[PDB]
Amino acid sequence: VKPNYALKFTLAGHTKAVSSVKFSPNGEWLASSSADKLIKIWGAYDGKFEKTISGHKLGISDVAWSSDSNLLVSASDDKTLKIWDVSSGKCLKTLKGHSNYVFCCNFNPQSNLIVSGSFDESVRIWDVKTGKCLKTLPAHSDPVSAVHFNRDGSLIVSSSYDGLCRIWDTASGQCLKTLIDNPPVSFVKFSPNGKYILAATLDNTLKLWDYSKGKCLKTYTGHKNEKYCIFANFSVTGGKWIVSGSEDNLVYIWNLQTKEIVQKLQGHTDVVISTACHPTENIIASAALENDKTIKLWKSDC
Ligand SMILES: CCn1cc(-c2cc(Cn3ccnc3C)cc3c2CCN([C@H](c2cc(C)ccn2)C2CC2)C3=O)c(C(F)(F)F)n1
């Protein structure tokens, strides 16, 4: 079994590299952030441009949706995060505290909290309602490349250029495990069932780790990844795949269990820095850096 993702739409509008794309949890929208300091919202199914959201004073590295699809948070080189009301485009809150670029962000599933990671080597946990920083974790000794809550919000996983992946208790901020401890760990994400962690290292390697046992279960290679932090994903709407961007301008798709490459999606003209999987349909969004600046939507039968 192999998917057959085919290109359906190319979305143009950003004037610099696109940094992150994310589907809304209700499946209706794709949000994109860019070095051009803008967030753009597009229809997830037909790619139609919906709106531009502006306000950050420097480029944006990352965006994330609340579970009810009504809020976005963005992480910017202006050292803030901003919380946006998607319907109005208005900035509801500016989250101040980080002392260097904010690189990565995520709501918890409850969406009462935001987690952020920064070039200042800290992980911060923010109250969505008030905009106040609740906790600052001295999480790493180099820039934080990823922060992600698990499926019930009780855990946070972080990764860093210091070579480490750490798992944190949300409630207390205490470190439960140092899972990886070494080249930079450029990306980390919990699996949908929370039992595994997908971890990228800047040596052409993606690894599936059993979080409870602390053991690498699978290794995925083939893609080019020596420079950039690239978003990877568990695709679960059809076959069980691993999806990643790549510095050779392709989207890579692997069989999660066999580790074989099952598809490479060709079309982008620069580094594919971001991929995202639709919540209910076999749809992938990909986005590329400044020689391309587009977002592409792909569809598969499985
Ligand atoms: C501010 C506007 N902006 C930000 C980015 C952006 C976006 C992503 C994708 N990303 C966002 C959050 N999570 C993920 C996976 C990865 C990177 C970057 C630029 C920085 N770097 C490297 C780097 C990262 C770190 C942590 C430390 C040291 N170097 C640097 C190139 C060597 C990335 O890899 C872009 C752009 F154009 F590249 F898309 N524009």
Which H or E run contains 185? strand 185-190
Q: Residue 229's CB: how many other CB atoms inside 10 A?
A: 26
C-alpha closest to that of 31 among 203, 218, 276: 276
Query: d(Cα 2, Cα 173) in Å, to the nearest integer?
Result: 41
- Are 102 and 80 spatial neighbours (Cβ–Cβ below 8 Å)? yes
- Are 135 and 125 spatial neighbours (Cβ–Cβ below 8 Å)? yes
Across 28-122, the runs of DSSP E, i.e. the strands, are 29-34, 38-43, 49-54, 60-65, 71-76, 80-85, 91-96, 102-107, 113-118
- From 14, 16, 19, the mutation candidate for ligand 1 (largest count of ligand atoms within 8 A of CB) is 19
* β partners of residue 275: 286
- Are 77 and 41 spatial neighbours (Cβ–Cβ below 8 Å)? no
State whether the beta carbon of 120 lies less than 6 angstroms from ligand 1.
no
Q: Which two tokens stand for residue 184?
A: 């930079």
- Are 120 and 98 spatial neighbours (Cβ–Cβ below 8 Å)? yes
Q: Which residue has the tokens 């509008």?
A: 13
Q: Which two tokens stand for residue 151?
A: 């499926």
Q: What is the largest CA-CA distance in the chain?
A: 48
State whether the beta carbon of 231 lies less than 6 angstroms from ligand 1.
yes
Query: d(Cα 238, Cα 302) in Å, to the nearest integer?
Result: 5
CA 154 – ligand 1 centroid, Å: 27
- Locate the ligand 1 atom nearest the alpha carbon of residue 290 and give its number: 37
- From 33, 62, 81, 103, the mutation candidate for ligand 1 (largest count of ligand atoms within 8 A of CB) is 103
Task: Count up the domains in the chain and report the number.
Answer: 1
Q: Which residue has the tokens 């210091």?
A: 162
Q: Residue 138's CB: how many other CB atoms inside 10 A?
A: 10
- Are 111 and 98 spatial neighbours (Cβ–Cβ below 8 Å)? no
Using CB atoms within 10 Å of the CB of residue 88, give its burial: 0 to 12 exposed, 13 to 18 middle, 19+ buried: exposed
State whether the beta carbon of 187 lies less than 6 angstroms from ligand 1.
yes
Experimental method: X-ray
Q: Residue 15's CB: how many other CB atoms inside 10 A?
A: 12
CA 62 – ligand 1 centroid, Å: 9
Q: Which two tokens stand for residue 155?
A: 């855990």
Beta-carbon contacts of residue 149 (< 8 Å; ≥ 6 apart): 106, 107, 108, 109, 113, 115, 155, 156, 170, 190
**Residue 268 phi, psi (nearest 5):** -70, 155
Instruction: List alpha helices for 94-135, DSSP H.
Output: none
Q: Domain range for residue 107? A: 1-302
**Is the torsion defined by CA of 140, 161, 176, 101 positive or negative?**
positive
CA 8 – ligand 1 centroid, Å: 27
CA 196 – ligand 1 centroid, Å: 24
